[PDB]
Design an enzyme around this catalytic site. Structure first.
Site, PDB file in Angstrom:
ATOM      1  N   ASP A  37      12.294  15.333 -36.498  1.00 31.33           N
ATOM      2  CA  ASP A  37      12.458  15.975 -37.792  1.00 31.33           C
ATOM      3  C   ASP A  37      13.515  17.068 -37.695  1.00 31.33           C
ATOM      4  O   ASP A  37      13.836  17.554 -36.608  1.00 31.33           O
ATOM      5  CB  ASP A  37      11.131  16.563 -38.274  1.00 31.33           C
ATOM      6  CG  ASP A  37      11.112  16.816 -39.767  1.00 31.33           C
ATOM      7  OD1 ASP A  37      12.163  16.642 -40.414  1.00 31.33           O
ATOM      8  OD2 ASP A  37      10.045  17.191 -40.295  1.00 31.33           O
ATOM      9  N   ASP A  71       5.447  17.475 -34.246  1.00 33.88           N
ATOM     10  CA  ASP A  71       4.392  18.460 -34.040  1.00 33.88           C
ATOM     11  C   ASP A  71       3.605  18.684 -35.335  1.00 33.88           C
ATOM     12  O   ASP A  71       3.192  19.790 -35.665  1.00 33.88           O
ATOM     13  CB  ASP A  71       4.982  19.765 -33.512  1.00 33.88           C
ATOM     14  CG  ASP A  71       5.994  20.376 -34.460  1.00 33.88           C
ATOM     15  OD1 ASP A  71       6.371  19.714 -35.448  1.00 33.88           O
ATOM     16  OD2 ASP A  71       6.409  21.527 -34.217  1.00 33.88           O
ATOM     17  N   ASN A 120       7.104   2.643  12.445  1.00 28.73           N
ATOM     18  CA  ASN A 120       6.827   2.733  11.014  1.00 28.73           C
ATOM     19  C   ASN A 120       6.266   4.098  10.641  1.00 28.73           C
ATOM     20  O   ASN A 120       6.654   4.673   9.617  1.00 28.73           O
ATOM     21  CB  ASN A 120       5.869   1.623  10.584  1.00 28.73           C
ATOM     22  CG  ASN A 120       6.320   0.254  11.041  1.00 28.73           C
ATOM     23  OD1 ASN A 120       7.502   0.035  11.303  1.00 28.73           O
ATOM     24  ND2 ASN A 120       5.382  -0.680  11.132  1.00 28.73           N
ATOM     25  N   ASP A 127       7.992   6.780   8.133  1.00 28.72           N
ATOM     26  CA  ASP A 127       7.324   7.321   6.954  1.00 28.72           C
ATOM     27  C   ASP A 127       7.346   8.844   6.956  1.00 28.72           C
ATOM     28  O   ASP A 127       7.513   9.472   5.902  1.00 28.72           O
ATOM     29  CB  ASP A 127       5.888   6.806   6.880  1.00 28.72           C
ATOM     30  CG  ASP A 127       5.813   5.297   6.834  1.00 28.72           C
ATOM     31  OD1 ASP A 127       6.830   4.661   6.487  1.00 28.72           O
ATOM     32  OD2 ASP A 127       4.738   4.744   7.145  1.00 28.72           O
ATOM     33  N   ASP A 144       1.845  13.158 -37.471  1.00 26.76           N
ATOM     34  CA  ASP A 144       2.778  12.596 -36.506  1.00 26.76           C
ATOM     35  C   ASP A 144       2.087  11.850 -35.374  1.00 26.76           C
ATOM     36  O   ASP A 144       2.771  11.316 -34.496  1.00 26.76           O
ATOM     37  CB  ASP A 144       3.669  13.698 -35.929  1.00 26.76           C
ATOM     38  CG  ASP A 144       4.607  14.287 -36.961  1.00 26.76           C
ATOM     39  OD1 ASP A 144       4.950  13.579 -37.930  1.00 26.76           O
ATOM     40  OD2 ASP A 144       5.005  15.460 -36.805  1.00 26.76           O
ATOM     41  N   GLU A 146       0.812  -1.210   0.000  1.00 26.12           N
ATOM     42  CA  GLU A 146       0.000   0.000   0.000  1.00 26.12           C
ATOM     43  C   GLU A 146       0.846   1.262   0.000  1.00 26.12           C
ATOM     44  O   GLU A 146       0.321   2.350  -0.259  1.00 26.12           O
ATOM     45  CB  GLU A 146      -0.936   0.006   1.208  1.00 26.12           C
ATOM     46  CG  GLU A 146      -1.805  -1.230   1.311  1.00 26.12           C
ATOM     47  CD  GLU A 146      -2.809  -1.323   0.183  1.00 26.12           C
ATOM     48  OE1 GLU A 146      -3.445  -0.297  -0.134  1.00 26.12           O
ATOM     49  OE2 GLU A 146      -2.963  -2.423  -0.387  1.00 26.12           O
ATOM     50  N   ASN A 179      13.906  -5.390   9.893  1.00 27.74           N
ATOM     51  CA  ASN A 179      13.138  -5.451  11.137  1.00 27.74           C
ATOM     52  C   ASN A 179      12.384  -6.772  11.260  1.00 27.74           C
ATOM     53  O   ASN A 179      12.369  -7.399  12.329  1.00 27.74           O
ATOM     54  CB  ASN A 179      12.168  -4.273  11.220  1.00 27.74           C
ATOM     55  CG  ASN A 179      12.877  -2.940  11.329  1.00 27.74           C
ATOM     56  OD1 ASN A 179      14.084  -2.884  11.564  1.00 27.74           O
ATOM     57  ND2 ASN A 179      12.129  -1.858  11.163  1.00 27.74           N
TER      58      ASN A 179
HETATM   59 MG    MG Z   1      15.905  -1.997  11.921  1.00 27.66          MG
END
Ligand code: MG
Ligand code: MG
Ligand code: MG
Ligand code: MG
Ligand code: MG
Ligand code: MG
Lengths: 898, 898
Positions: free
Chosen positions: B373, B641, B734, B738, B645, B331, B709
């Site tokens: 081009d 462009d 944790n 983060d 193309d 996640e 860990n």
């Molecule tokens: Mg550790």
């Protein structure tokens, strides 16, 4: 008042950060044509035999090894001028400390507290020392950065020396200041003479001595004298003097004089007298310093007298008055100017803009007229298309080979046409031409005839002179043309036909260079400009040097920034007009160089203001136009990278050159761009405007706040029975304010301030001080009334509550008010200060709040503040900020911010 | 193992940040030629009378006002595809909170501590909620930034609408998503059809429907049907469908379908099934997520079983195992990818590089072949020199005026030659030609004939057809030539002479465009491609398009970065070769388009690898070459462009276009440059490599530390009589890790990492985790031994000292180890982390140290640490850093960093 000579309280900045270096071209006038024993030295050195020359300077053909070069440098000094050498750091620290106010504050501190109260004089002296160290560290760091920047772009010389422990020689590019006498160098085209030289060997060496002898034509310099009498050192054909350029040819010479001993260095300029006349920046700094001295001399004696009469302690009243005055000292100016400008100069270096002296920044932001040539700045300097054709328009290989001979065998500076012709010729034909033809002579380029000739030979019977140049100049000396393979006389019909064809080509943006050739019987004498006669016109080469992709946006940005771009070119009027049209510039009606020769200075100064493009200009015309463009208070910048652009660069208010320029162009310049681009110049101008605005804001806010403090002391000291604040507290307040102000060089500047060329008026500082001082005094008096009645600090026994009560108000407001007066707009929503300034403001406010509560407070005679005071403090600060924000508008309307 | 279908723990990112848009050009194949009641609807709409068309869509001729347009939008939806509508923020917060590990964590927390130990389940649920909030905030901010960036460069449409209170109209440029059915728009050349349209009026409107009907020739769309039977919605001449472009002409039409209801939108693509095939980036993200799931499924059950058997508390052992596992959750991948890439995508926006979807960044840094081009990228698109002459070489005014007629009266896209001819004609002659001549018809440009014609008339008796195009194509259809004022038959001698003259001109870099004119009797019918026969060749215009000043440094930088630049051009091989030589590119041996038609796919793929310049290419040739250049695992980028193309942009691994391109070129592109420059592209590539490197470093460090860990828990849990750390402490660890890692997107990247095209291997993450995990476990076991014996945390009664003793070691090392395993070099001297990362590391370390000493420690079951522990803590951290620094070399040798 007057008595300006009496005031020696001003410490001037060293004259390398400010003011230009003397350039060795201070006209042809001399002080009695140098003194005896210097002209005699040169005259003896010129005709001295080459054999005994080695012993005189302790030099060997191998060159110089290390120990020998340090020995020579120690004996003869360093190759610089007296004013370009930095003082030792201890001398700088001492000159910072001996400030006539740092001394009195220490003596008055000793006198006031010497009897029965020590640790109070010592702490005052320690505060003085800490302020001195802060100032010295700022100035020393900034001068170190500036000196590093100036040495980044310095003219170099190619020397033998000795590389590798083995003892092998090489050819080192060393700065010209490292040249010791009796050093062997080699010279090529475009190299300026770094010191007085003795020519050991040379082939086709031509030097432009127009700076010294005043003659425009380059002069041949031989290895051994070939003229009968000398009678004069400046005209001997075997010595090269410093400050002159090498036009063409190659040479290897010996250094004979160095530094001051150089002809130009001593008694022919530079050493004679000193820098009597200061420039605009130095004059403005002196005016600001005198204004601050006047404020102090008006205010501080009154503060001394009032407290002396009221409280009967003169040795303390004088110290108190001096302590409030030191806030308005001029000694801030060396620290502010050096630290703020050198911060910009370093930041400009990351933008490919090297600033050789700091004051140039002022001009770089104040420039509103930019004079430049069209080649390299507007065009690309690399030609994409080229057609070598005869007079009939057919492509001709003979024209290409004739031009290739001239391009290959010329020893002058490289040219875009030369590069194209050398690249436009195939390898096989180039090899055949190189093997079949050998060089015999070269007649270099000069503006009187505007041609260039090379005499080569395929045998020992006849020589071929091939000269290439602009079409008319070639047609002037051509008597025959090669048409359809036959040599036919060049009549007038062909003349007008060629002229109209080449004018049609010119209107397309094509530059046309004609080529002429001649055959002469072999001869031993040198060829001279008189040999360019009765030539045979082979044809012409028409080439296109396209405009840069970024020239039009750069010009639009320059115009949007208030800079008027003017094009000074020696090229044709039609090609220059076409280039100006392509890049979006409005050429208007063009003015050729021949037109302005008969105009008066007033007429030319009036004409140049409405003329955008000047064509067919000699370097004298460019210098005259740049000189007369400063007529109505304009600041003029000239951008050039040529041999003859030194007078024009030195005559402009700011000279800009390129890192790839000739040596004399980099020497005479004030700004060096690392790449030749108008966009880099525009961004650098915009960034230097920010630096100057930050410097002005620094001085302005500091002076205004300190004037407010002095006024607060002056008005309310009489009514109090004790000093409103102890002088120790005032010294701490000023020191902590300076610590905060350290981060002003890193502030943000509104784009509104730097949108137009800056105009600096030192008298505006007095108006700002008068307007924004009493605003602080109002709330200082309010704080006095608060601590007198609300907090009952009514007697000397409880004076410490009063004084400390003002202290936190004194430091916090003075620190906070920066965020209100730094801009003309509303703060924190429209214009906001930079993060370093935010952080410094917060830190200094925290320190000022926590100082009375710290253990040091007893030592500093500060008493802890009751908690009922902080809401009053916040109310006072908020009221002060709101009042100044509401009142700023009146100053804006009546006088204005910028 | 397998069981991939069972794993629904992966939450994919929304398919707008990743994956391309449908691009309504998905071949000519259809699902049974659309379904009935859609083809019938279009057929009825086509032939429906214009009078009753206003009531059907509730539309008035003047347009639509506000309330009406919101009503129509509400009834018919918004003009988008179902995959482009963002989900509401509350729905995003729910999906971030309902993932199986945030649900199992909460459920196990309730189960374990519900009976007699409340406020322990609540705090665990609160930690879960805070982690979910952090993830959701990061993803929401980053998706908002990405969606804003994609909306900056969006195809717009010109609408009548209603402006101001008065009710007056204008012509607004609104994004194509805002188009409601029954809206009136106007179309010009280069505009893509934004929705299904009913043509109200049309002046020579030609549309290229090659995407839908599969025919390359543009077809004329009229206001009223001029064909007998329709029988087919796709070929009715009065409706324009979305995804097609307007080649030439002008029109005003009405929107009849919108969004899904558009012919392409429903059942003809983008509706049936879904994005079945994921691209490389999505596959790599899925592989990384599956690797993390495999790690968790292998490890966590063992941790559960060991602690369940040892301590006999399964409802707590399962919670502990899940808490250590959640560190390895997939996640984080939506949060890591979205936050790191968007920060890059924003930074590219300040570099004039807009990223339409995030995953394109991966390709942008992985590009090693760039196909462009020559016009606009290598050359400026403005031409400096032009010569309009006849076949004999003399300048001709008739050629210029004939070209001016064609350039002025053509309604197609503007061209550099058209601009030059319109600017190269003086005002008087231009106005005389405009008054004297009137337009009648236009035959637009197509690649089968490569010409363009305009039929004008000075009267009602005869018409003049003036065509202009490349020299051969014009010469193919010319039968006479105007020589010396006489119309003479164009024999073969003149053909060879003209061919060699124009070949000589093209070798100089001059593009040559021939002009032909013809007189025909007046007629009412429309002119056709056939009418271009038996023309009279007036002459040709030779013009120079100079290379950009910055093309050579940009090409050198591109080659230094590992990108191989290849030139795909439809121009002549001589002009292209000269342009390539001018800019420093090595053309080698050129391959023309006619050569590759007979080649096989293997042959062309082998040839294109060693070929730099491809000339005379049709758009099909360009698409085929770009497709076969990805043969050996190369990542190919195409920059274009143009109108045609779109297939080449869609076929390349990355498609780059310009803000000034045509609508279909911006629709098909993945990257939009704000200015057409190679230097901007090079710098953007360099900075995007940094973004991808930062993303990989984020994932790599987080996974490795959390695996360490988990391993530490797995090995040493059996021997201890209690949990090594309480799961609450693990969740806090944790979360605080983060918070620190939030600043990794802003890290610095070594120039060594981004010096070559990046190749991403998801299997490398497993090797990094296996190598760098047990290094943390060694010191975790050392800390366990320290707390067991040195600090005597031997019993459950004193377990809290043990657990907290690990906590500060667990958080500080995991936070510190970032500065060691972020670079291959030696930290803090050879490579330094960015200041945001330094600040976040310091703050998180301070918080981790101060948490056991804070009042919250009792609530979090943390016990204060004795001061004898801290020297051991510093020793452990220093030993861990030194060991990992010394061991990094082995990983570098065996596998390598990049
Ligand atoms: Mg550790
Ligand atoms: Mg040199
Ligand atoms: Mg000579
Ligand atoms: Mg004050
Ligand atoms: Mg449009
Ligand atoms: Mg028609």
């Amino acid at each position: 008042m007057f008595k300006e000579i009496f005031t020696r309280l001003i410490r001037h900045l060293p004259s390398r950060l400010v003011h230009r270096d003397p350039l060795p071209g201070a006209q042809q006038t001399v002080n009695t044509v140098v003194p005896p024993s210097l002209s005699a030295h040169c005259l003896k050195m010129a005709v001295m035999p080459e054999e005994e020359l080695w012993k005189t300077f302790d030099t060997h053909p191998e060159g110089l090894n290390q120990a020998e070069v340090e020995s020579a440098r120690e004996q003869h000094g360093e190759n610089k001028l007296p004013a370009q050498q930095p003082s030792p750091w201890w001398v700088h620290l001492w000159v910072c400390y001996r400030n006539p106010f740092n001394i009195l504050l220490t003596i008055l501190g000793a006198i006031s507290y010497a009897t029965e109260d020590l640790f109070a004089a010592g702490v005052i002296a320690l505060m003085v020392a800490i302020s001195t160290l802060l100032n010295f560290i700022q100035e020393a760091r900034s001068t170190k950065a500036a000196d590093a920047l100036k040495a980044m772009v310095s003219n170099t010389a190619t020397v033998l020396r000795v590389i590798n422990d083995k003892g092998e020689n090489g050819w080192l590019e060393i700065p010209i200041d490292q040249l010791v006498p009796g050093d062997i160098i080699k010279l090529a085209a475009g190299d300026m003479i770094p010191a007085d030289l003795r020519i050991l060997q040379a082939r086709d060496l031509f030097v432009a001595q127009a700076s010294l002898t005043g003659e425009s034509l380059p002069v041949e310099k031989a290895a051994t004298t070939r003229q009968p009498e000398h009678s004069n050192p400046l005209e001997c054909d075997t010595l090269c003097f410093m400050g002159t350029t090498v036009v063409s040819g190659t040479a290897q010479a010996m250094v004979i004089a160095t530094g001051a001993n150089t002809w130009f260095g001593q008694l022919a300029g530079r050493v004679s007298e000193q820098e009597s006349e200061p420039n605009a920046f130095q004059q403005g700094i002196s005016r600001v310093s005198m204004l601050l001295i006047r404020f102090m001399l008006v205010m501080a004696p009154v503060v001394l007298l009032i407290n002396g009469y009221t409280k009967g302690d003169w040795w303390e009243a004088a110290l108190f008055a001096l302590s409030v005055a030191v806030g308005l000292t001029p000694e801030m100016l060396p620290m502010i100017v050096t630290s703020t400008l050198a911060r910009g100069a370093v930041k400009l270096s990351k933008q490919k803009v090297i600033v050789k002296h700091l004051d140039a920044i002022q001009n770089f932001g104040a420039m509103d007229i930019l004079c430049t040539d069209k080649t390299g700045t507007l065009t690309q300097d690399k030609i994409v298309l080229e057609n070598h054709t005869d007079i009939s328009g057919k492509t001709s290989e003979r024209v290409l080979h004739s031009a290739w001979l001239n391009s290959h065998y010329q020893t002058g500076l490289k040219n875009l046409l030369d590069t194209a012709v050398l690249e436009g010729t195939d390898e096989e034909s180039a090899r055949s031409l190189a093997s079949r033809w050998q060089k015999i002579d070269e007649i270099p380029f000069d503006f009187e005839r505007r041609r260039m000739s090379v005499v080569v030979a395929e045998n020992t019977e006849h020589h071929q002179l091939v000269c290439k140049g602009a079409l008319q100049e070639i047609l002037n000396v051509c008597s025959q043309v090669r048409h359809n393979g036959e040599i036919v006389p060049l009549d007038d019909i062909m003349l007008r036909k060629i002229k109209r064809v080449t004018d049609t080509l010119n209107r397309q943006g094509l530059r046309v260079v004609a080529v002429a050739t001649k055959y002469l019987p072999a001869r031993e004498g040198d060829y001279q400009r008189a040999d360019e006669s009765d030539l045979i016109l082979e044809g012409y080469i028409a080439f296109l040097d396209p405009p840069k992709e970024t020239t039009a946006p750069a010009l639009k940005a320059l115009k949007a920034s208030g800079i008027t771009v003017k094009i000074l070119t020696g090229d044709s009027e039609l090609v220059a007009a076409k280039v100006c049209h392509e890049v979006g510039l409005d050429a208007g009606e063009v003015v050729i160089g021949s037109d302005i020769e008969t105009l008066s200075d007033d007429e030319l100064a009036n004409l140049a203001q409405r003329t955008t493009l000047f064509a067919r200009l000699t370097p004298m015309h460019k210098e005259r136009i740049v000189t007369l463009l400063k007529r109505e208070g304009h600041v003029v910048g000239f951008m050039g990278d040529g041999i003859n652009d030194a007078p024009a660069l030195r005559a402009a208010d700011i000279g800009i050159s390129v890192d790839g320029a000739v040596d004399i162009a980099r020497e005479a310049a004030d700004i060096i761009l690392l790449e030749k681009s108008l966009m880099v110049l525009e961004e650098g101008v915009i960034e230097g405007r920010r630096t100057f605005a930050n410097m002005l804001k620094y001085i302005k806010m500091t002076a205004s706040s300190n004037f407010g403090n002095v006024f607060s002391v002056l008005v309310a000291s009489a009514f109090l029975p004790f000093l409103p604040m102890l002088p120790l507290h005032l010294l701490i307040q000023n020191l902590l304010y300076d610590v905060s102000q350290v981060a002003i060089p890193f502030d943000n500047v509104d784009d509104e301030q730097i949108q137009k060329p800056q105009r600096w008026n030192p008298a505006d500082l007095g108006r700002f001080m008068i307007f924004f001082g009493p605003i602080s005094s109002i709330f200082d008096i309010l704080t006095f009334c608060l601590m007198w009645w609300v907090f009952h600090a009514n007697t000397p026994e409880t004076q410490t509550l009063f004084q400390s009560g003002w202290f936190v108000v004194g430091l916090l407001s003075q620190t906070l008010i920066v965020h209100m007066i730094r801009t003309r707009r509303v703060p924190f929503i429209q214009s906001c200060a930079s993060w370093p300034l935010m952080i410094m403001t917060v830190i200094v406010m925290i320190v000022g709040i926590a100082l009375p509560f710290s253990p040091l407070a007893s030592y500093l005679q500060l008493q802890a503040l009751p908690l009922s005071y902080f809401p009053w403090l916040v109310a006072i600060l908020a009221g002060y900020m709101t009042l100044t924000q509401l009142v700023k508008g009146f100053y804006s309307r009546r006088y204005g911010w910028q």
